[PDB]
Design an enzyme around this catalytic site. Sequence first.
Site, mmCIF file in Angstrom:
data_model
loop_
_atom_site.group_PDB
_atom_site.id
_atom_site.type_symbol
_atom_site.label_atom_id
_atom_site.label_comp_id
_atom_site.label_asym_id
_atom_site.label_seq_id
_atom_site.Cartn_x
_atom_site.Cartn_y
_atom_site.Cartn_z
ATOM 1 C CG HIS A 52 -1.838 -1.083 1.395
ATOM 2 N ND1 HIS A 52 -1.482 -2.291 1.954
ATOM 3 C CD2 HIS A 52 -3.146 -1.193 1.054
ATOM 4 C CE1 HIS A 52 -2.526 -3.101 1.939
ATOM 5 N NE2 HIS A 52 -3.546 -2.462 1.389
ATOM 6 C CG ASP A 55 1.670 -1.108 3.640
ATOM 7 O OD1 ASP A 55 1.092 -0.898 4.728
ATOM 8 O OD2 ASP A 55 1.257 -1.912 2.775
ATOM 9 C CG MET A 86 -0.860 -6.054 -6.721
ATOM 10 S SD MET A 86 -1.037 -5.434 -5.031
ATOM 11 C CE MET A 86 -1.306 -6.997 -4.182
ATOM 12 C CD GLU A 179 -7.944 -8.060 -1.648
ATOM 13 O OE1 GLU A 179 -7.012 -7.445 -2.206
ATOM 14 O OE2 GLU A 179 -7.833 -8.578 -0.513
ATOM 15 C CE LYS A 181 -12.500 -8.833 5.122
ATOM 16 N NZ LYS A 181 -11.716 -8.025 6.099
ATOM 17 C CD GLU A 215 -7.530 -12.195 1.716
ATOM 18 O OE1 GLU A 215 -7.832 -12.296 2.928
ATOM 19 O OE2 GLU A 215 -6.963 -11.196 1.253
ATOM 20 C CG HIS A 218 -11.494 -11.549 1.559
ATOM 21 N ND1 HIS A 218 -11.060 -10.401 0.933
ATOM 22 C CD2 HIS A 218 -10.834 -11.603 2.743
ATOM 23 C CE1 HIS A 218 -10.197 -9.771 1.716
ATOM 24 N NE2 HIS A 218 -10.039 -10.483 2.818
ATOM 25 C CG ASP A 243 -4.590 -11.208 -2.207
ATOM 26 O OD1 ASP A 243 -3.726 -11.088 -3.102
ATOM 27 O OD2 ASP A 243 -5.049 -10.248 -1.570
ATOM 28 C CG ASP A 253 -10.037 -11.437 6.577
ATOM 29 O OD1 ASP A 253 -9.809 -12.581 6.135
ATOM 30 O OD2 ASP A 253 -9.550 -10.417 6.042
ATOM 31 C CG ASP A 255 -6.054 -11.953 6.582
ATOM 32 O OD1 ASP A 255 -6.841 -12.370 5.690
ATOM 33 O OD2 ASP A 255 -5.900 -10.739 6.784
ATOM 34 C CG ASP A 285 -3.756 -9.971 2.282
ATOM 35 O OD1 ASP A 285 -3.146 -9.650 3.322
ATOM 36 O OD2 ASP A 285 -4.750 -9.344 1.849
HETATM 37 MG MG LIG Z 1 -6.266 -9.496 0.412
HETATM 38 MG MG LIG Z 2 -8.385 -11.208 4.522
#
Ligand SMILES: [Mg+2]
Ligand SMILES: [Mg+2]
Lengths: 385, 385, 385, 385
Positions: A52, A55, A86, A179, A181, A215, A218, A243, A253, A255, A285
């Site tokens: 990002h 980031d 990406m 993306e 979700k 993802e 998700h 992802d 979520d 992850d 991710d």
């Molecule tokens: Mg993701």
């Molecule tokens: Mg996630």
Amino acid sequence: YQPTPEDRFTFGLWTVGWQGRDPFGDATRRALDPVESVRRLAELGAHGVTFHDDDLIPFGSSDSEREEHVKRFRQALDDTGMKVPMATTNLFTHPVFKDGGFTANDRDVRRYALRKTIRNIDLAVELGAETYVAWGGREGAESGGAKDVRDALDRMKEAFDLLGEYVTSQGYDIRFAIEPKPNEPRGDILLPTVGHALAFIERLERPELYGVNPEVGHEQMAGLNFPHGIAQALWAGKLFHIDLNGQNGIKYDQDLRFGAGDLRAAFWLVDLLESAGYSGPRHFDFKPPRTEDFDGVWASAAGCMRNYLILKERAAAFRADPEVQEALRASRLDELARPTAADGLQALLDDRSAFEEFDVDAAAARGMAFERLDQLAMDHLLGAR
Amino acid sequence: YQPTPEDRFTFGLWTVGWQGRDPFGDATRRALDPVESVRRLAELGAHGVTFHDDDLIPFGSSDSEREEHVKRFRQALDDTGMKVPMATTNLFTHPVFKDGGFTANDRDVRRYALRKTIRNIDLAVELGAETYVAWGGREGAESGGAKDVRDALDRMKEAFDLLGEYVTSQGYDIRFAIEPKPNEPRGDILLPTVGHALAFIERLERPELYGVNPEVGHEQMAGLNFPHGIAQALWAGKLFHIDLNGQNGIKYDQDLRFGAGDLRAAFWLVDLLESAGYSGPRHFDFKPPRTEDFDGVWASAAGCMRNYLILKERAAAFRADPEVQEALRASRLDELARPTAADGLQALLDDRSAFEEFDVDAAAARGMAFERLDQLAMDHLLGAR
Amino acid sequence: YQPTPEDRFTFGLWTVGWQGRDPFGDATRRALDPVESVRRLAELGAHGVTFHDDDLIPFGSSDSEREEHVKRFRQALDDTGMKVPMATTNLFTHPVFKDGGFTANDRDVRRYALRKTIRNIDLAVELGAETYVAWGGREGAESGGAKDVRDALDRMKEAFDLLGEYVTSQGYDIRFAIEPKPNEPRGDILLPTVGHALAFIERLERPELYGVNPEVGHEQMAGLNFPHGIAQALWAGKLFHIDLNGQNGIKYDQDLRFGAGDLRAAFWLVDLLESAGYSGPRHFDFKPPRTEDFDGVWASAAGCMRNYLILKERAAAFRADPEVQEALRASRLDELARPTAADGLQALLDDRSAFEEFDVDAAAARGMAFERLDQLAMDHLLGAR
Amino acid sequence: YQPTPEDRFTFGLWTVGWQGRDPFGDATRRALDPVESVRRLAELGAHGVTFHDDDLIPFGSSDSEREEHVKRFRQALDDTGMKVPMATTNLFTHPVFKDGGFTANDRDVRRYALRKTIRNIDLAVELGAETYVAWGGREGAESGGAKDVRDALDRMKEAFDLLGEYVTSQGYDIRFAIEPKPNEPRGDILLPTVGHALAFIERLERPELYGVNPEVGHEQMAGLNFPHGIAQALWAGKLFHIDLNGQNGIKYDQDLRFGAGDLRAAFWLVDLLESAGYSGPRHFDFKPPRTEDFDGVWASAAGCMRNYLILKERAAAFRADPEVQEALRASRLDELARPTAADGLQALLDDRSAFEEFDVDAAAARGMAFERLDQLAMDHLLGAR
Ligand SMILES: [Mg+2]
Ligand SMILES: [Mg+2]
Ligand SMILES: [Mg+2]
Ligand SMILES: [Mg+2]
Ligand SMILES: [Mg+2]
Ligand SMILES: [Mg+2]
Ligand SMILES: [Mg+2]
Ligand SMILES: [Mg+2]
């Protein structure tokens, strides 16, 4: 099962760099310098990193500080050979985005969201990214009257159409991936599944510039079958990025590292990606659990890649087994690939074997032999053949 | 709150006629003659009925018996003034369909499925139906190797493209609506949500002939927001029909009467349908619970219509309240309807108020006032204003 | 991985004998004679069978027909060496039970339910069953006013207390196991999870006669962790029986073969059962998918046992690996087993190292090393060590 | 619908004082002084407040600062008449608790957890609290090998038994309430539902000191029926406290204001609490959405109380309606309250009307009339009678 950059494994800076702050607790790890994340991931055999804007360049940085942060990053990339395939925008952390970015009710916020995104598209192209991801984590609502969804979709189309005009006018070779979700952090998020995103893309001015970035976790937050949704994205020609992670059912979520969560789904996913010849990045991710110190962070990231490579081996052994190929024919997967009516509509209407003389009881009695096939798949997954 | 045919309330024959057989129990009610269902629903104020081919003409009927069943049905329609706006095929009950109809692995079954469907399209047109619904309840899988989803989608497109060629060649004025469902009776069903169906339609040869028939309970079986999905279908111009019922969360398909299950979602749904001017049938696909006798069946069906009309009144009072219109402006719903950048891309890039001079802290401090708005909606729903 | 009767694998007659009728379709297989099921399961290496009263003796049988059905069954058991360790009552199929058995609103139905149960307890004892299972599949409601749950729990306690008085007065050596399920076929079922059942047992007159019969898929229909619930049942000393199968998340009760569904949960379950020394039957309550013919039925049942034995081998290798034992110490599983305060309350209050001088930052910095441990478990499951 | 302190509405300091930090975003509101929260809630008609130790006294405070924070708080209570009926410990925010408090793998952390809790029990008694809540939000695991659940339950019993010894030895008039939650922030949390907590309490040394503090949203995160679980807690005599809020299905813990989320469940909950004569606090554990400014915070809190009072009025009108009382008899709710077999076991065995001469077909034909009853409940909820 040792990874090499040929495997095209990539990680977000925000993944290994997650400090462990969750809705009920403070951070458990110190922040990571992006340059150290690059070197440690290169050591583990990763192919590249993603980011990002916020980031890499801390929010509210002058152009001088911004210049210095990028130069340090590029020097780490040149030192290690790591790529940046990406990039994406942070349109969710700052309070200004509390009602969304592209679909915020306030017009001035929507304009700021677009300007913030465009600035990072320029940076992404400079660092060589081929895909620009958009995750609209704040586009949504907690209550029904707060958001007219038809107006919100108008605003969402307008924003994406403007981004496509921008990259077209600049001559950039970059594509967008949406993306989806279904929820969290908003009560319901707009474009909640792969299907809703694929449908939305077909209403854009230049649909060929946009695809999806699904993802694992998700789609599983809606209890959907992730390999099935990926097949539909491949069927439409829209799987631009993916992802990988793990999720234990319908809840927040998680992850988890790839391979944790639904293990059989991860097997069928790898089987699909490898048999369809997906050639994009295998992006993780994930979040190392906040129980872990930095040694646990790197073990968790190594485990992502290891688990992909074990599953790749098992699915390849499955498809190459003559006994499996024979079982696939026994279940008529070969007949599924053949056209129902290549003889055309009129021939079908005149075919008495298709209706007037069709023996429905004899066809109904034929077993599908699906359980023997699935136990062969189980035996292969577990290394018991 | 008394219904009239002007309200366009319709029921499936299979709804009030459900005998109460479920996965763990025998039927609790005798079968209903379709002619008696028509008369009892006309008495309750319904506008019309719908049917599967096998609801009206028992499977395996000669053309003579078929002729007699239709004549009795038409005479009941002429006696009562009831209409038949929609029809659909049963491609799920007979054992021959245990692996699907349009996407069965066996080619001969797929051909039989298409012939069975076409025969009922002819009947639907004769009785005046404007919409033909397809619910692929057996298109799916319980295990990963049983179904190559890309091949299955090829077969699904081929079947729908053939149906569109048929109705085009015959000159029929009828449109198709795909009804999604995420699971049950298969472990995962293909095209599991509104979004996946909308995406699939855009790949057909004549996309303008196809829309969606969403069902309240089906999207809620994936934990999705049903009013949000309906807004996306309306936004794409594809809401051709709708199935109203009730569902209590993520579990088996309950098919409760409309208004039971998620009451606030039903309020926001009626608000959307009435404000967008949906003019199609208000169709109820529900099952009177098997605890009930025939008196309970008719009370349950009357309750479907009553609950729609109470919610219609409350949502209309909500939108007409000046205090609500003032709260909608306070939450900037008016700004959501205005274009983000009607001044175009270049003007946006040059606008320093959109970025360089944008006061992000002042914008972030503005509350959205969504909770006061939602409590006004609650007060209106409950009749407490 | 070949089963022997020493492994104590058992099957319900209703499992391999399921004819494939589901809420949307007719049966796809003919009915099985119970005598043939016994012989085919003995051939596969099963240890025994279980039954509902109505599986063995068709509902509404005279005492003469009942006598003949039992004699044929006993002769098949003597011919094969198969045992009958568990039996249960069908209080869900007949229409009379549409509002429940023990908690039906109608008093005369509740009395009939108890008489029907007692008759089959006598039969179970005759055939040598040690456990009598009760699954209250119809005890529940679809709407809130239909069932006062406090009155229903009074009626449930009264029924179970009466059954305990009956077996005590007759001198039977048999114990009861309550099987929980959160929903389906009722909208919500009473005692919906292991925890609710364990809590209810402690209010019975003779709690020592009652335990739980948890089923993998049922706890997973509430998204709960099945190995965690089994640990709590073992901790309370109440795991009298267990039902093994597979389930893919929160949806209708799938009853897949054991090992399908959540594979990692099945691994942790076998690890727990074997390390805790569970010595009861390994019972499979599953349904061969209705896609299958009888060859698929027997392949599905063989797969249940195979998958248990592969998981048993992998979990045993996991716990015996010195590298795993070392990782368990690194994560302080040894410290979890040691008392927090065997020195007593006063010593704890006076211990300045427990509070006044406790270094909270040093303790917080210690990583738990859980991800390395879990990847060792993954490697063992997959046979990659 | 104006609240008064007679209604016993209470709020956690952490509820209206939630700054809006979530897993993906920074805080959107400044911190609230606890003294201002007390005065603003008193103005709205609340009866009292509750607190975690770390809400009132910031973590790591000297005894001098601690003394000053408490004195300011007590002066606000004396100024407003507000009471403090409940208190609880924060064993989840600080990094030291990342693997739990009472069931952390590290022994020294478990000892620190107990000392931190005991210090706040003393403070709670001083301020007049009658109930001490324990929510073990970090007791759990993300992976299977990290936590032996039987050892963890041993450690959990040891901690609670020690707390009961402490309050007994000091002569405190305070009771404990365990608050269950199925997941978040851990992947699975120990004692995940009301039922598991009720079962666990019966294994403590002094079970009479412990009850449950159920929360609406937590049981709904497992898809369970919250009014049903509350009835079971009341039936066991263990409903010591209750947390009211709103939740939209199975997903992350939303903590919406009471009345949002599942509206019909909130109606049946109020009906149960008022008809059973629950006399404890009506406590709201909710979070004003981070979209809101401070004006929205107070509107959201006022809405909690308003919605309880509207539902209380509607449920009371429902139960007082003669037409409803007549429908309750038509559905045999009166028969559900009568003993099945007050004549005893022997009389039941000899009663030929209970079996040999029971007309099963006549009983099965009786409809339950549940749908008419539920539509009367709907009409009352909506104010349409
Ligand atoms: Mg993701
Ligand atoms: Mg996630
Ligand atoms: Mg349905
Ligand atoms: Mg439908
Ligand atoms: Mg089951
Ligand atoms: Mg079972
Ligand atoms: Mg909560
Ligand atoms: Mg709470």
